[PDB]
Amino acid sequence: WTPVTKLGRLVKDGKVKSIDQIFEFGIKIKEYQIVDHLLPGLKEEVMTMQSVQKQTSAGQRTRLKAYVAIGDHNGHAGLGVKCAKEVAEAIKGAMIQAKLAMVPVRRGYWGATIGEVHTVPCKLTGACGSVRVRLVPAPRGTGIVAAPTPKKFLILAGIEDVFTQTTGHTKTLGNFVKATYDAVRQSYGFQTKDLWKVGGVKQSPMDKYAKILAE
């Protein structure tokens, strides 16, 4: 309520309907309340609750770092990280970052265009630090063949069939989820053959309604 951004103003008065209308034009989401408006009923998952420490003269200053993955099962997902002195505040703080870090997930078919979309369109690899995760499209029956850590994330993104091959120190969970999210994050940057067509002339929402929000 009472947004502080131009895009955030458009959403509150119901001028921007779909979330993907934001994603086409690269408009950054700077308020989490925007995601809660155009993406109702976001399922919730908490991956790990890891504690970091800082050595001081008196002792150790411990803070709790929380990874949360968010997203509806219709091709939208996000991952957020926040560390704070309390567990309740850490999840709430990571909640906001997860919503602000929403990213569309491109999914296609394996071999036949029989609805509906189930698996990734091509081969994607996400590079966190030493951990590398590779996603391979799979036939209809095969589930999410992956470790328990990215399988929880891939469920939220709405990918039901996938083949995964992992490399690196997967025992550190922070990089494992980040490498999973990094693989999906670039699914829409791989210009396949079917995306050759330029497309029609569209207009940015921040330009269509530029005069309207001026007052």
Binding site: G26, G75, V105, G189, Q191, L195, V198, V201, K202, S204
Partner: protein, 81 residues
């Protein structure tokens, strides 16, 4: 529908634009009449993020502007491809 959306295509590199690409721009050049006053009609140019951060956006656009006619002699003949 299967696609979430149809991503934009960079006018300079003829390559897709990422949803997280926060350096890409969108330059609108309105058409002008015989009197020399702008019109509500305009043409839209999109430049990818990585192109800008190299020093290439300005020269690459001049190739497109000259081709579309908004410039006359900025870019030499042997530099147009």
């Amino acid at each position: 529908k299967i696609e979430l959306y149809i991503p934009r295509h960079c006018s300079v590199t003829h390559t897709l634009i990422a949803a997280d690409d926060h350096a890409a721009v969108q330059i609108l050049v309105p058409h002008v009449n015989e009197n020399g006053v702008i019109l509500p009609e305009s043409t839209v140019y999109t430049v990818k993020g990585s192109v800008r951060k190299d020093g290439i956006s300005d020269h690459s656009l001049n190739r497109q502007f000259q081709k579309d006619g908004f410039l006359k002699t900025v870019v030499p003949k042997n530099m147009m491809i």
